[PDB]
Write an enzyme that holds these catalytic residues in place. Sequence first.
Site, PDB file in Angstrom:
ATOM      1  N   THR B  13       0.850  -1.177   0.000  1.00  0.00           N
ATOM      2  CA  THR B  13       0.000   0.000   0.000  1.00  0.00           C
ATOM      3  C   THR B  13       0.895   1.240   0.000  1.00  0.00           C
ATOM      4  O   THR B  13       1.990   1.218   0.532  1.00  0.00           O
ATOM      5  CB  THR B  13      -0.976  -0.048   1.187  1.00  0.00           C
ATOM      6  N   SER B  44       9.650  -3.160  -6.559  1.00  0.00           N
ATOM      7  CA  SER B  44       9.707  -2.821  -7.962  1.00  0.00           C
ATOM      8  C   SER B  44      10.973  -3.306  -8.661  1.00  0.00           C
ATOM      9  O   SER B  44      10.944  -3.493  -9.884  1.00  0.00           O
ATOM     10  CB  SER B  44       9.482  -1.341  -8.191  1.00  0.00           C
ATOM     11  N   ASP B  78      11.420   2.576  -7.367  1.00  0.00           N
ATOM     12  CA  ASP B  78      12.756   2.323  -7.895  1.00  0.00           C
ATOM     13  C   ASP B  78      12.752   2.125  -9.406  1.00  0.00           C
ATOM     14  O   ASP B  78      13.605   2.676 -10.085  1.00  0.00           O
ATOM     15  CB  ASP B  78      13.388   1.096  -7.215  1.00  0.00           C
TER      16      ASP B  78
HETATM   17 NA    NA Z   1      10.518   0.433  -5.106  1.00  0.00          NA
END
Ligand code: NA
EC number: 3.5.1.1
Lengths: 314, 311, 325, 308
Positions: B13, B44, B78
């Site tokens: 979240t 990510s 990222d």
């Molecule tokens: Na990230």
Amino acid sequence: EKKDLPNIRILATGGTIAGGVESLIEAVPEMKDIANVSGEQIVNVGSTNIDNKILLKLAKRINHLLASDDVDGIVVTHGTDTLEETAYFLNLTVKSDKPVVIVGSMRPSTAISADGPSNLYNAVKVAGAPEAKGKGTLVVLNDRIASARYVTKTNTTTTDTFKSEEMGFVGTIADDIYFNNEITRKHTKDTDFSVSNLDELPQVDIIYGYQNDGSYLFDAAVKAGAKGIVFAGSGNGSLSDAAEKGADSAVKKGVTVVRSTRTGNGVVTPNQDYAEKDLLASNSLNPQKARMLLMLALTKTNDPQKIQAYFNEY
Amino acid sequence: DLPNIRILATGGTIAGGVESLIEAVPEMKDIANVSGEQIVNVGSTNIDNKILLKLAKRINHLLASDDVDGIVVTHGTDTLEETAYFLNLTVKSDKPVVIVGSMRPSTAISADGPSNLYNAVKVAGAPEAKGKGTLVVLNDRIASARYVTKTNTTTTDTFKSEEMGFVGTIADDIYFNNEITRKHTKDTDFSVSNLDELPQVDIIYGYQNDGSYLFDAAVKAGAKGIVFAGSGNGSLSDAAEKGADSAVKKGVTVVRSTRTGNGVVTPNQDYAEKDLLASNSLNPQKARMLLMLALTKTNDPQKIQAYFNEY
Amino acid sequence: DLPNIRILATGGTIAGADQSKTSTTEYKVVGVESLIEAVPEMKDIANVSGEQIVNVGSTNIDNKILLKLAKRINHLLASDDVDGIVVTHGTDTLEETAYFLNLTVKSDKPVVIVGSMRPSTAISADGPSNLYNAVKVAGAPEAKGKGTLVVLNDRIASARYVTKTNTTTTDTFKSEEMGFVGTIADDIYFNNEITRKHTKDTDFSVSNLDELPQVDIIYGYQNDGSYLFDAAVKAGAKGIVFAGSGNGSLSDAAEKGADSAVKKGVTVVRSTRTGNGVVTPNQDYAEKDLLASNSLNPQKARMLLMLALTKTNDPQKIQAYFNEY
Amino acid sequence: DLPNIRILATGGTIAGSLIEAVPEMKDIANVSGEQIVNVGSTNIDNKILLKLAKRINHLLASDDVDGIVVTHGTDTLEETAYFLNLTVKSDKPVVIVGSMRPSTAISADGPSNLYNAVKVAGAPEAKGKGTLVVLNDRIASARYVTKTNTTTTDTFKSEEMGFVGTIADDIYFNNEITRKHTKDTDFSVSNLDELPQVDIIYGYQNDGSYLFDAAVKAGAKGIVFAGSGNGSLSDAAEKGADSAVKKGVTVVRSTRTGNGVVTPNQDYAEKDLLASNSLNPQKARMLLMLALTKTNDPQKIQAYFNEY
Ligand code: NA
Ligand code: NA
């Protein structure tokens, strides 16, 4: 009978940025107003072909010259591509508080509005300024005086490429020099590094982070003989699971691994999960500048806590 | 009545389960009818080509329905710019797709995720967001996926474009300022509808005293394309150029990008004659996305170079 | 078959000269034909001709000159012999002239404003490249319909978003929030088209005007007052732009001065002294007709306010202009 | 034991009683506070500045105050911060903080800003850095910072000088400024009840002399001109400035651009139209008011503008 002026030596590493080093010097006759200028050609290469051998030769020569009472300051002319690598290496290895100013040009000397003449004049002005003593190695282009510790080349082609978004410049020029900041990191005469007795540097390679990356480039670097690896991680020095497998394997094989960032700015912070596995943090050093400090660190120690401490002070 | 906005979550979240995100920012109910789904749940750095294909296909399916006016994708910061640019090249609709994240955890003091999410939903539902290309919305800014990057490791104001600025900004109301000139979304020639994998593309970094051996390793690992993050204007050392030339001779497409962060990598006669292509104003990781998609269409270096000038 | 580009010279550092080649801030005055002959490379990308409109430092560009310049540009762009125009100008008030032209040039053909930060005599003078690039842009087919452009230091900025951000540096003209329309790296790379209405699509014309409604600018700061508002009204201001702290904020004293001006029939627009961002509508200020300048800084807001007052005194119609132009 | 940090509030709360709003502060400082004034920042005036500098000087002279945080509206924050940089005669930290979003808004920035301000005020390495401005994880010098954007959270910046430091969990100090400040300045105002009047006039095309004439009539002792470019004046503005100088007013040329140095220009310097260095108009006003407490000599005032 003569005007007293500072003795400034130009050390050229490539072609002419304004207009041999002897001619370079005659293309900017305005320098005679503010210095007794002399010059020498160290090497003659494009900056992508500056290597550890050349850096050692250059740092040793600068240290020798600055130890003499006949040299007040030095200007190094250099290609812009890797200027920041050389400048930061000198910032860690020149054992003098006299000025060393690194300069280049973004436009060729033959171009319309070539930037080299002004850059070189300003570099010599800074190198001969009393107030430039003790500021660490400086990078001077486009009327700006940047620390080697904070500056990077931010743009492929523009005249205004050398900048630091977060730390700005040590000073600027507008006819006169305006010194604004002194950096807080240790540098030059105060570092623990010496290259007086070195003929080579520990091998350090750089691996880039991206989606769907792997471990194979880490493994290749280790096989090629890397003693250290800098990882240009996404965000705050982050690794994919695959990259982390490669990094962990490297650490187990005795390679020191430092996590830098591909973002361009900010600090890479220690992270508990990474720190407990000796995947170190690069602080506010970008990947290529982190490489310079890691090579020098590895000349002193293999202890990851001692290397991390260097990354927080230099 | 309000725009119907679907949130597709790819991680944890960013405010306050996808139901938790919605309940954390009740203000959204005044500007949209929000619903949501969890596509995947990863950090990510672990978003990969398989996930991108799944996400692009789902988005294309949803935007084809009249019950969806726009989409917000929540994503780790990222590698957000990689996903955003991929979607900019593969979503075949003019309806808004907005990628959003947070730089602070949802539990932190002054967490930025609630505002970021609210603004992303506001933009996704704005009629004037139609046809703008994929957008990235954090910290009151509306950036094009084509021009934005994450410029700072940790700061809330990290997503920026020094040279191209923002598509718009938010100060209570949305102020749209720019429309990008590159081809995107509805008009691209790329489709990933029927693809289960993408051509492998790796990234090699340039630096003093670098070598050819990383190029050799990427080729051995199956790279179909290599992006080189060159110093300055896509420059190569002699050693890197040996590695790159080797790769081209083995049928790998090589694109020169830059490690600098900004500016255009220009075609250079010496490099272009050897099919060492120019990345234009794409950074290494965004160049990688375009190169993968180019290689679904062609191996012709002149055609790939033309894609790099238009997308 | 090369584009026919006319250079209209107005003065500025780009035509200045000092005997010291290391002086960047002190200089004396170079003619338009000299500027052109200093850049012979231009002949390969355009058929260039020049005329001297005026010859002044840019702080001495005034409404009389702007009207003359806009009228001349409109007449020239109506001809088939002119593909685009470059205006050489001092940098200090370049953004004022550029934005005025962005609102009054009634053509989609390129108009590019250029200057230099170093005099023509300086080492590494920036004017030659700036002028070359301005001519390159003015002759580019893709420059059509972009609005008035400002070209220095390899950058192509919209007049609507650009400002001079630094006293002396070559890279001074920037927009932090909106960036550039395009950049130059050998070739032109067009990146953005602005969303605001401009040039051929505005409601403004200066074809029959010999003067503009007087607009003055007042600056906000701690311990400021009302007396400078009062003095601007007395001096004949029809509009006042207030360079407020933050988001167009006023002290109690400034608000007293502004309210008194509005009661006397002067239109007051709140801009910002910060340099960037949007001055948003504010319910308390809008109820009293203290308008919001959007993303226009004080001097650019003045240009729009002067032209608005040629059309209307209605504060709601003026505010709507500030939202679209 | 933890540093004793005193919060001086100048208006409404920026977070959320602040300790209740940001309880994490208890782990890094012993916090106390006071409501020194209660105004919007556009209504901070000379009387308030004098009150604030006297009170801060008194507090920092005590051994049981380690550092101070001032909560302040953002519009004029840079004016107060720079004034304190020139008048607080201590090396102990003074940190000025605000919020760009109201405390009640979604993702309010004040709680983090305040926490970081207290963290910096209690940091041993903040000693001797000059007055600091802390918002959005950044630690800016009062001498170099300005509010650059109307509404964004990242508004306080310095393009050319950057930040003194940044915060990413820990504090990273990066720069020490080279200008004279705080403990080392020659300004003392603890016993003054007013400051010499200084007004600001803006430069633009088709401006005039009338605003100069009005400022002189209103009792200005100094005038800062926010000139186009490098402190440039139109002919009309220059006539007004010269009239002011002849009537005994000190005139300093600043810039409306936002960045860079205003340099001494021979033709202007010959006429005592001074240069503001890298001070913007509103910050140049603070230095000129304090300069005029010491002298009316234009050469001495110029020298202050080169050192402070
Ligand atoms: Na990230
Ligand atoms: Na000028």
